[PDB]
Every structure is written in structure tokens, then in C-alpha cells.
């Protein structure tokens, strides 16, 4: 509950440091596995 | 003799942004934090809004949002009915077989807590739709949007 | 001259932005490149501000 | 806390006006203040300090 509000408040922060901001934005998307890779490549 | 680099994308002169008072902010009436967020790609900003089409479609998209709210409420009540069925199964199991006096209430409270979480998810959906509708209804130029 | 370094950084990041836009890149990478270019021009005009 | 830092009125005043109830509440607040921008947890709240 309070932890949830804390996490949300955190997500709305700049962190100034541009490396820090990019390192934050790259973690949004999860990784994949082999079958996901092959289906994705087939789509491409 | 001087040269010049043709920037692939525009940039803002730092002297008119960071130098307090932020002259860009005073001109545009954007708070220095908001200007720093927009300029350094930390928050979007609205630059144009068709007030006419906003006004006229404030009923059609209202109808669409009513349809979507009805659909989310229908899945909500279906989840509640599934809870009711599972709770009937749980109470049948508890009071039909020989179990502890509290174990039956333990599982029943567990199920009602699962439904409390389901209703919390329903509130999450209600927020996700209604906050967005409210954001549109007051959408005007020079408004900052965090949480992309 | 200590200014050829800042100009070199600006030109590198501008050319890289041009190439990233030309190839077609996800908005994450191109926006990061744009932020870097803005920072490079800022550093060129005033370091440490 | 009142057993050790109890003799002074300043300490009792701090405990009363602190409003933080619980060890985990204090750890959560401390983590939220020390390293903001990352998702608060329990592991990175304790091992942090």
C-alpha cells in the first residue's frame, strides 16, 4: 500500500544524471527466451 | 571566418533556460522544473489542442468511454460472480467435511481477501480510465505529462 | 585548444543522431541521442551549469 | 528508545512527534529518502544502511 505509493512516486523522478535516466528507461522491457527470439525474427 | 554545424534536431540555448530567472520559462510560463523535464526528455508536453473537436466529440468519445467503462464493469461483476461460486464451493467443502472450527473461516476469509484484491484491481481500472478521461477534458497547451 | 573537444563531441553526437534517424531506431535510442546532443551543446556554451 | 534516550525531554518530544510507527516503516522511509527513483524493497532497505 504505502510501498506502492512510494514506488509510483519514484517512477516520476528525473534523476538528472543522463546515464542514470537511460539506465532506468532500458529496464522497462523484460528479456526473452529462444523461442521468443525465433518468432520475433520470423516476424521481422 | 566562422562555420556552423547544422543540428539534426533543435536544441535550446542554455543561457535562456538555466540562467535564473529562466527567461524561456517566464516567456512560456513553464516552471523551471517543467522546462527542464521537457527539454531533457523527461516528460511530454502538449503543444496544440483542437478545442472545437474536443467540444463536439465530448459526447461521442463520452459514449465510447461509457461503453469501455461498462465493459470493464462487466468483467468486474463476472469476476465477483466467479468469486461467489468459488466461495460457495469453499463453504461447501468446509461445512461438509470434518475440518477445524477456524480453518473454514480461514479459507473463507482468504477468499473474501482475494475478492478484496479483485475489487482493488477494479478500482485500479476505474482509475486508469477515469483519470485519462479527466486528463483529456482539461487538456490544454503547455501542460506537462510525466509517466509516459 | 580545449574547444575542439567540445565541438568534436557536438559534431559526433549530431552525426550519430543523423545516422540513427536515417536507419530507423526505436524512440528510446533516438531520444537518448537527442538528450545527449542537447547536453553537448549545453557543455559547449557553459560547462558545469 | 525511551529506555536509553529517555532522560531528556527532547528525545521524548522526538518520539512523540516522529509519527513513524514500526521498524519496517522507518526502513521504508529511509530507503525512499536515501536512494529515490528505484523501486523500494525490503532487501535494499536493510542492506542499504
Curated annotation (Swiss-Prot), chain A:
It is found in: Cytoplasm. Belongs to the sigma-70 factor family. RpoD/SigA subfamily. Interacts transiently with the RNA polymerase catalytic core. Sigma factors are initiation factors that promote the attachment of RNA polymerase to specific initiation sites and are then released. This sigma factor is the primary sigma factor during exponential growth. This is RNA polymerase sigma factor SigA. It comes from Mycobacterium bovis (strain ATCC BAA-935 / AF2122/97). The lineage of its organism: Bacteria, Bacillati, Actinomycetota, Actinomycetes, Mycobacteriales. The chain holds residues 210 to 253 of 528 of the full protein.
From Swiss-Prot, chain B:
It comes from the Bacteria. Belongs to the RNA polymerase beta' chain family. DNA-dependent RNA polymerase catalyzes the transcription of DNA into RNA using the four ribonucleoside triphosphates as substrates. The RNAP catalytic core consists of 2 alpha, 1 beta, 1 beta' and 1 omega subunit. When a sigma factor is associated with the core the holoenzyme is formed, which can initiate transcription. This is DNA-directed RNA polymerase subunit beta'. The chain holds residues 91 to 238 of 1316 of the full protein.
From Swiss-Prot, chain C:
The RNAP catalytic core consists of 2 alpha, 1 beta, 1 beta' and 1 omega subunit. When a sigma factor is associated with the core the holoenzyme is formed, which can initiate transcription. DNA-dependent RNA polymerase catalyzes the transcription of DNA into RNA using the four ribonucleoside triphosphates as substrates. Belongs to the RNA polymerase beta' chain family. This is DNA-directed RNA polymerase subunit beta'. It comes from Mycobacterium bovis (strain ATCC BAA-935 / AF2122/97). The gene is rpoC. The chain holds residues 338 to 386 of 1316 of the full protein.
Curated annotation (Swiss-Prot), chain D:
It comes from the Bacteria. Transmembrane segments: none annotated. Belongs to the RNA polymerase beta chain family. The RNAP catalytic core consists of 2 alpha, 1 beta, 1 beta' and 1 omega subunit. When a sigma factor is associated with the core the holoenzyme is formed, which can initiate transcription. DNA-dependent RNA polymerase catalyzes the transcription of DNA into RNA using the four ribonucleoside triphosphates as substrates. This is DNA-directed RNA polymerase subunit beta. The gene is rpoB. The chain holds residues 247 to 295 of 1177 of the full protein.
Amino acid at each position: 500500500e504505502a510501498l506502492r505509493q512510494a514506488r509510483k512516486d519514484a517512477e516520476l523522478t528525473a534523476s538528472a544524471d543522463s546515464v542514470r535516466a537511460y539506465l532506468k528507461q532500458i529496464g522497462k522491457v523484460a528479456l526473452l527466451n529462444a523461442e521468443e527470439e525465433v518468432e520475433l525474427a520470423k516476424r521481422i | 571566418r566562422m562555420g556552423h554545424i547544422e543540428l539534426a534536431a533543435p536544441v535550446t540555448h542554455i543561457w535562456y533556460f538555466k540562467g535564473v530567472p529562466s527567461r524561456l520559462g517566464y516567456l512560456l510560463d513553464l516552471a523551471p522544473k517543467d522546462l527542464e523535464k521537457i527539454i531533457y526528455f523527461a516528460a511530454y508536453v502538449i503543444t496544440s489542442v483542437d478545442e472545437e473537436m474536443r467540444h463536439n466529440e465530448l459526447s461521442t468519445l463520452e459514449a465510447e468511454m461509457a461503453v469501455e467503462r461498462k465493459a470493464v464493469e462487466d468483467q468486474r461483476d463476472g469476476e465477483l460472480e466467479a468469486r461467489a461460486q468459488k466461495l460457495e464451493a469453499d463453504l461447501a467443502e468446509l461445512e461438509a467435511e470434518g475440518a477445524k472450527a477456524d480453518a473454514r473461516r480461514k479459507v473463507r476469509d482468504g477468499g473474501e481477501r482475494e475478492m478484496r484484491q479483485i475489487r482493488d484491481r477494479a478500482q485500479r481500472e476505474l482509475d486508469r480510465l477515469e483519470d485519462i478521461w479527466s486528463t483529456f477534458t482539461k487538456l490544454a497547451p503547455k501542460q506537462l505529462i510525466v509517466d509516459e | 585548444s580545449d574547444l575542439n573537444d567540445l565541438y568534436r563531441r557536438v559534431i559526433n553526437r549530431n552525426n550519430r543522431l543523423k545516422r540513427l534517424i536515417d536507419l530507423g531506431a526505436p524512440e528510446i535510442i533516438v531520444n537518448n541521442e537527442k538528450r545527449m546532443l542537447q547536453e553537448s551543446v549545453d557543455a559547449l556554451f557553459d560547462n558545469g551549469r | 528508545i525511551v529506555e536509553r534516550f529517555g532522560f531528556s525531554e527532547i528525545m521524548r518530544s522526538t518520539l512523540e512527534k516522529d509519527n513513524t510507527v514500526g521498524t519496517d516503516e522507518a526502513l521504508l522511509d529511509i530507503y525512499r529518502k536515501l536512494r529515490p527513483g528505484e523501486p523500494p524493497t525490503k532487501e535494499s532497505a536493510q542492506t542499504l544502511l
